[PDB]
Design a protein around this ligand. Structure first.
Ligand SMILES: [Zn+2]
Lengths: 287, 341, 198, 330, 63, 53, 188
């Protein structure tokens, strides 16, 4: 009878594999298996994550083929992947990320070997593209109902675990079903390779190609955007002619939610492209 | 709260018992079965579903259009269940008029008595002496004292009074219930070891009317169809012969159309003999006198003579009824009502 | 962005309470396949939520937020309309028994709208017109009391139609019970109009 | 205490209000809703399962729909019958002594004074059916009030309760039959029978079903049903033979002498002046019931009571008689 | 005639009608439809008169 | 859109007929608060960006 | 022009975008299209149709030798009924050869159980014949609708003869039939 404060390490491998698996996350139930290595009690690291073929039955213990699982795991053992399985993941579209009776039964059956048995449910269907916040699930012991529910130390990270604060699922089904915190990790090779890879993904090939395109489109296409920009500017100035009357009458309180200032600041920012690219044309013409 | 105390303490095992029996798919009823694996089912939400049969329910226990429990996760049939109120409401087991009310028909009472009383008493005599016992008779025409011979046939069984079925209960809202009605009362007729079933008021289901043509043509398919039985009993009671479909389909299995209009002089004293167990009649009252002092006095009309005359005997505040005290009720209820009718 | 989780809440429903229960479990009439009885949130009291009113209810937590909703004619009329123009205060010291209303019977050629809106236009006060739907405008006349009210639409044996008409006769009788009953707001003066057997 | 406050998770946020259909002896009942969702779950606490009377609205959940509680229905049943015993007996009205001893002898012989009822061996538990040309509860309640002296009573006035709502069917008649079953020593009184006189196709089938359940095909002698309409021609001839099987009677025309007796009864407790004549009062009336003369006796006793006097003068009773002369002509 | 001529159109415009036959029997030939003559339609017209006392004694003997 | 009960918050009727209570976004001014207007929320966020003419 | 409003069959309306593959040709309004559950993209459109239009545009009879199997046989055509048959094999022989369509007109389609306003079907179907440039009309078993109206006809005969009056008004009335062809088949 002892418990610690565990935290699931999530690298970009399992993340991107759950993003491609979320793209393949059809309404039909899907299956997946997580791998890794157990170094101590209160830490768990995932490295290898793959997908499983779909079945008409869906998420179930019968769909997990032991000769296929052990066959692929053996083919990972003959390669440079000497990691044992650490858990299984799946997708729950529509009805929420909670776990049904079948999922908790195959979780109870799959947790006999690994005491941790990390469970992750990805649901990118109804989640907006602004946040990719994912949560890992855990199974509590049925004999711990007499004593405290979760005797987990280091209660600081629970404030970060309070971000999924839906008022129906977390404490709507929190009995006999709790969760765990999630952190990330990134080395310098992922930082510089993925950082320079994304900057290059927003940059050009030689980085000098599409500059003169806009530098010379300022004279052909942007002129229409400058004339229309002046049409919006005058289209606001026609009301700014009426503003000094109200400002000359009341001077107390603000009733119009429009600021008429920051939009024109943005118009000036779009208009400064001519100034910033004029020096570019000066460099291209010079040398 | 005192009832909820012992059950509240008995609510602990309801959590460990909540995982089973949780399955409920709104009790969807099936329609037919093309093959044994796949069953076509239709839910009440007008959504037709198809699922395979589970291992907990035998295929021989499946009935056409049977409401059974079915899972909403595996979609399989976990456990069936036995379950209109008019069907069980129409059950009738009560003693009633005996044979003593024969309405003067000397030959007709034997034409129906040899088919209502004799075939049950002598099953081997009619199979060996012939090929099968007779089918039944057909009482129709003028109402008069109708339904008296029906109670006669009900009470004149030496074993147990049987069920009678009126026809005015099928013309109701939500048509289609008649099919399951006749199929489950004929199924119960198979359960009652070849019991006899009487069908009253065929005119209330015969003679748009296609929704009635379903129940009455299916009724013909269940009568001419010997699946429940083709030998027990056939008898219909109607006021008018304006039902041509049962009249043209009846020669297949129904037979022996007879009539029962009115009794004779020596019969009304026998309806008074069955009224000897009615409201207390003094020994001074002669049944032959009161019987002969009223012509055109069929068993129903003199049943109303004993009803209204019974009412005036109650209003008289007397210990016993005397003919001199209710004869005014007799000739008043037959003559004052015979004036306009 | 903290509200973005309430955007992810898929919105919220519109609850309508029809009956309050004493067990702190108020049933709320909702959209069909609704009728979800539930206890309200702890920061909102139960007694304040009145039945037969619409409220704001969340779609998952089922918690309540708040409650939801002619020179001679002008010479003779100066004492009637031109008197309350300049001295609204004198209506408490003056004890000369100012009249409550005035009637003008005859062919309504000029004087029904141009006179009342012209002299009332000199009064610079609001002009409310009458134009069962005959009681809500009387409640509006109770709210905005200081004005010039004029009958224009009604000017056109006992029976049920004389009982329904007797509802408006009761409206003007209680106008004599309020006006002639007790003065509560200066400048209450009205003008009658009647041209027939009435 | 904790076991009482631990089932709050089921009655918490995931809670709904459904409509139960029936209770099955296999400890799992069937419920319904707007779409008719049938879920069977083992019963829980706080339920009665005996007085529940299936077929009403119950409490459901967003969960597997375990029944956590129930909610009482129809406060509408309260306005159906009266539970008091009025002092108006069968000896307070005259002229129709035979007409009142016909129903008194008709329905007061069963269950009371049984030596003339159970020794005969007839038991016609159907009762008589009456109709009052004045109606308005005065004559029909003055004849039915004889049974109200020392007995339980059941009253039903008007067919509005069937027509003021959607076509639920004969379930309300089943409620009257179960309250009459649990209240067998009572008298069923149906008043203002204007079902077919006032969809319309369903009124005929719930009225013929009213005749079906009213006939008592499965019940023994349990209660005496007394029906009372206004016009005997509105009722179809099919509602006569099954329903009316005991006896029916006719009521005379209340023109001068029956209105003189009604006036005497309505002016027996009150005090009137000597100059109050009767010929003008029984002359100015024309086909009037007792509710309006009771209304002018009430407003005449109050109007004469305005002067702190109980004596009703002739001019004040004619001034109140103008309400009678106007009301019937309006 | 709409339904009947529809059936005759399904016995005239359908060359793959070589499948299951459609046997018909009429109790009287007073109103004889002239459009019932075709290879697929009612072409086999074998007259079945009233059996004589000999034939009635035969069918009654075997029955 | 059905009704506006207060500032920065109103009710909106869905296409299925059920009325929804959603807090409007602060960027949208009071011009889009017309009672009879063609408002359009999000499929998941259920927030209005602009109305349709 | 890039993003427009869609109307789903179920009742709720949505707005979608434009896919980089398709163009603005089929994107014009008034054309039923298809959508996807994810991202509400557009794969292709959905051409509308009707129920009887499937029957009028689906039946096809094969066989090209039947045109040469009619035997030694070398604005309207009358196929009457002497003691010799095979008119269905010939009309269905050329109809099975090309016929340019399968516009079959059955004599049981002018029943009009309700009020006899079959003029909407004469002008509707013959308006389809005038709309489509090629058209061939078959009229088999016209003897049922070919009543001679010798005596005073009832309401059932007067409406059929009124459709014959529309046939008169559209054959020798104020409308030519130079391009369309009708084949009147009968029995007597
Ligand atoms: Zn699922």
């Amino acid at each position: 009878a002892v418990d610690t404060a565990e935290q699931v390490y999530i690298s970009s491998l399992a993340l991107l594999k759950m993003l491609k698996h979320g793209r393949a996350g059809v309404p039909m139930e899907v299956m997946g298996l997580m791998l890794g290595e157990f170094v101590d009690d209160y830490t768990v690291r995932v490295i290898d994550v793959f997908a499983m073929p779909q079945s008409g039955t869906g998420v179930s213990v019968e769909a997990v083929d032991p000769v296929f699982q052990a066959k692929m795991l053996d083919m990972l053992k003959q390669t440079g992947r000497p990691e044992m399985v650490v858990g299984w993941y799946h997708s729950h579209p529509g009805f929420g990320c909670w776990l049904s009776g079948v999922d908790i039964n195959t979780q109870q059956s799959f947790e006999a070997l690994s005491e941790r048995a990390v469970a992750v449910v990805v649901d990118p269907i109804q989640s907006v593209k602004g946040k990719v916040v994912i949560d890992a699930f855990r199974l509590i012991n049925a004999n711990m109902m007499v004593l405290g529910h979760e005797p987990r130390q280091t209660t600081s990270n629970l404030g970060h675990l309070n971000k999924p604060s839906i008022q129906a699922l977390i404490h709507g089904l929190n009995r006999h079903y709790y969760s765990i915190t999630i952190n990330y990790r990134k080395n310098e090779l992922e930082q510089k390779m993925l950082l320079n890879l994304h900057k290059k993904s927003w940059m050009e090939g030689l980085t000098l190609q599409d500059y003169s395109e806009h530098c010379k489109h300022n004279e052909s296409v942007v002129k229409e955007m400058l004339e229309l920009a002046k049409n919006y500017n005058k289209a606001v100035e026609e009301e700014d002619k009426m503003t000094p009357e109200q400002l000359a009458i009341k001077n107390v309180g603000k009733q119009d939610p429009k600021r008429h200032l920051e939009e024109h600041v943005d118009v000036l920012m779009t208009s400064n492209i001519v100034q910033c690219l004029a020096a570019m044309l000066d460099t291209v013409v010079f040398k | 709260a005192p009832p909820a105390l012992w059950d509240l303490a008995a609510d602990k095992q309801t959590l460990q018992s909540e995982q089973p029996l949780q399955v409920a798919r709104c009790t969807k009823i099936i329609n037919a079965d093309s093959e044994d694996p796949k069953y076509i089912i239709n839910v009440k939400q007008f959504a037709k579903f198809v699922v395979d049969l589970s291992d907990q329910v035998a295929p021989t226990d499946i009935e056409e259009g049977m409401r059974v429990g079915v899972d909403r996760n595996k979609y399989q049939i976990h456990i069936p269940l036995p379950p209109p109120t008019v069907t069980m409401m129409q059950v009738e087991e009560k003693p009633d008029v005996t044979y003593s009310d024969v309405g003067g028909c000397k030959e007709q009472i034997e034409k129906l008595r040899e088919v209502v009383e004799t075939p049950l008493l002598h099953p081997e005599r009619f199979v060996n002496l012939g090929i099968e016992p007779p089918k039944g008779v057909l009482l129709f025409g003028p109402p008069g004292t109708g339904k008296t011979l029906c109670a006669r046939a009900v009470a004149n069984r030496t074993d147990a009074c049987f069920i009678r079925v009126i026809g005015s209960e099928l013309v109701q809202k939500y048509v289609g219930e008649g099919a399951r009605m006749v199929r489950e009362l004929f199924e119960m007729a198979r359960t009652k070891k070849a019991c006899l079933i009487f069908f009253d008021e065929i005119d209330a289901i015969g003679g748009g009317d296609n929704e009635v043509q379903r129940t009455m043509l299916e009724l013909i398919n269940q009568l001419d169809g010997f699946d429940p039985r083709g030998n027990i009993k056939v008898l219909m009671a109607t006021n008018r012969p304006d039902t041509l479909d049962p009249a043209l389909m009846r020669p297949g299995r129904l037979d022996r159309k007879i009539e029962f209009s009115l009794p004779d002089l020596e019969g009304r004293t026998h309806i008074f003999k069955i009224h000897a167990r009615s409201m207390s009649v003094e020994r001074d009252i002669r049944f032959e006198l009161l019987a002969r002092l009223c012509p055109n006095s069929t068993g129903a009309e003199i049943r109303s003579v004993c009803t209204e005359a019974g009412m005036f005997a109650i209003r008289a505040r007397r210990k016993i009824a005397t003919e001199k005290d209710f004869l005014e009720a007799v000739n008043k209820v037959i003559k004052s009502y015979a004036k306009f009718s | 962005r903290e509200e973005l989780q309430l955007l992810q809440e898929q919105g919220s429903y519109v609850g309508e309470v029809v009956r309050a229960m004493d067990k702190k479990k108020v049933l709320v009439k909702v959209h069909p396949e609704g009728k979800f009885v539930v206890d309200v949130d702890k920061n909102i009291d139960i007694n304040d939520v009145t039945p037969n009113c619409r409220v704001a209810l969340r779609n998952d937590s089922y918690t309540l937020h708040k409650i939801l909703p002619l020179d001679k004619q002008i010479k003779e009329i100066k004492e009637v309309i031109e008197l309350p123009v300049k001295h609204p205060e004198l209506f408490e010291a003056l004890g000369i028994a100012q009249p409550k209303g005035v009637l003008l019977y005859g062919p309504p050629g000029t004087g029904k709208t141009l006179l009342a809106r012209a002299v009332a236009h000199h009064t610079d006060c609001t002009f409310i017109r009458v134009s069962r739907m005959v009681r809500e405008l009387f409640v509006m006349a109770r709210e905005h009391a200081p004005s010039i009210i004029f009958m224009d639409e009604i000017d056109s044996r006992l029976e049920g139609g004389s009982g329904g008409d007797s509802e408006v006769q009761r409206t003007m009788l209680e106008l004599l019970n309020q006006l002639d009953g007790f003065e509560a707001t200066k400048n209450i003066k009205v003008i009658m109009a009647t041209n027939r057997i009435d | 205490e904790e076991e009482r406050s631990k089932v709050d998770d089921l009655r918490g946020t995931p809670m709904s209000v459904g409509t139960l259909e029936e209770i099955i002896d296999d400890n799992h009942a069937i419920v319904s809703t707007s779409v008719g969702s049938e879920h069977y779950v083992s019963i829980l606490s706080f339920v009665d399962k005996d007085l529940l009377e299936p077929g009403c609205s119950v409490l459901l959940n967003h969960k597997v729909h375990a029944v956590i509680g129930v909610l009482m229905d129809d406060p509408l049943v309260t306005v159906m019958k009266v539970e008091k015993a009025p002092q108006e007996t069968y000896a307070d009205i005259g002229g129709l002594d035979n007409q009142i001893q016909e129903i008194k002898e008709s329905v007061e012989l069963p269950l009371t004074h049984p030596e003339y009822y159970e020794e005969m061996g007839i038991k016609p538990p159907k009762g008589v059916i009456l109709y009052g040309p004045p109606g308005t509860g005065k004559t029909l309640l003055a004849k039915a009030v004889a049974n109200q002296t020392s007995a339980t009573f059941l009253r039903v006035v008007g067919s509005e309760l069937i027509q003021k709502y959607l076509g639920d069917g004969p379930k309300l008649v089943r409620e009257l039959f179960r309250v009459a079953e649990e209240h067998a020593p009572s008298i069923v009184f149906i008043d203002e029978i204007d079902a077919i006189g006032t969809g319309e196709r369903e009124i005929q089938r719930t009225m013929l079903e009213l005749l079906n359940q009213l006939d008592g095909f499965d019940s023994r002698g349990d209660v005496k049903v007394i029906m009372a309409t206004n016009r005997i021609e509105t009722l179809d001839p099919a509602l006569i033979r099954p329903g009316r099987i005991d006896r029916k009677i006719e009521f005379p025309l209340p023109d001068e002498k029956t209105k003189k007796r009604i006036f005497q009864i309505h002016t027996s407790r009150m005090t009137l002046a000597d100059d109050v004549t009767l010929d003008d009062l029984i002359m100015a009336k024309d086909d009037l019931s007792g509710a309006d003369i009771k209304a002018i006796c009430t407003e005449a006793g109050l109007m004469a009571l305005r002067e702190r006097r109980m004596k009703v003068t002739n001019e004040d009773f004619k001034k109140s008689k103008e309400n009678v002369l106007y009301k019937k002509q309006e | 005639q709409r339904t009947m001529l529809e059936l005759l159109n399904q016995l005239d415009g359908f060359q793959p009608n070589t499948q299951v036959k459609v046997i018909a029997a009429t109790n009287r030939v007073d109103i004889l439809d002239p459009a019932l003559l075709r290879s697929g339609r009612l072409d086999r017209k074998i007259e079945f008169p009233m059996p004589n006392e000999e034939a009635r004694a035969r069918i009654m003997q075997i029955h | 859109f059905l009704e506006a009960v207060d500032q920065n918050t109103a009710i909106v009727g869905s296409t299925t007929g059920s009325n929804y209570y959603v807090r409007i976004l602060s960027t949208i001014d009071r011009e889009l608060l017309k009672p009879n207007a063609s408002v359009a929320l999000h499929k998941h966020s259920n927030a209005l960006v602009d109305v349709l003419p | 022009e890039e993003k427009f409003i869609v109307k789903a069959t179920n009742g709720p309306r949505y707005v979608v975008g434009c896919r980089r593959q398709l163009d603005k040709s089929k994107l014009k309004p008034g054309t039923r299209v298809a959508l996807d559950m994810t991202t509400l993209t557009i794969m292709r459109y959905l051409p509308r149709e009707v129920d009887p239009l499937v029957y009028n545009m689906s039946h096809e009879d094969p066989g090209n030798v039947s045109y040469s199997e009619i035997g030694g046989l070398s604005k309207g055509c009358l196929l009457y009924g002497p003691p010799g048959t095979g008119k269905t094999l010939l009309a269905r022989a050329v109809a099975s050869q090309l016929d340019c369509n399968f516009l079959k007109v059955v004599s049981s389609s002018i029943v009009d159980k309700y009020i006899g306003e079959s003029a909407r079907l004469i002008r509707e179907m013959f308006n389809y014949a005038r709309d489509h440039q090629p058209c061939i009309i078959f009229m088999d078993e016209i003897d049922a609708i070919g009543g001679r109206r010798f005596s005073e006809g009832t309401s059932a005969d007067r409406e059929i003869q009124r459709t014959l009056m529309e046939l008169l008004n559209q054959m020798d009335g104020f409308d030519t039939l130079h391009r369309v062809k009708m084949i009147m088949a009968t029995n007597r």
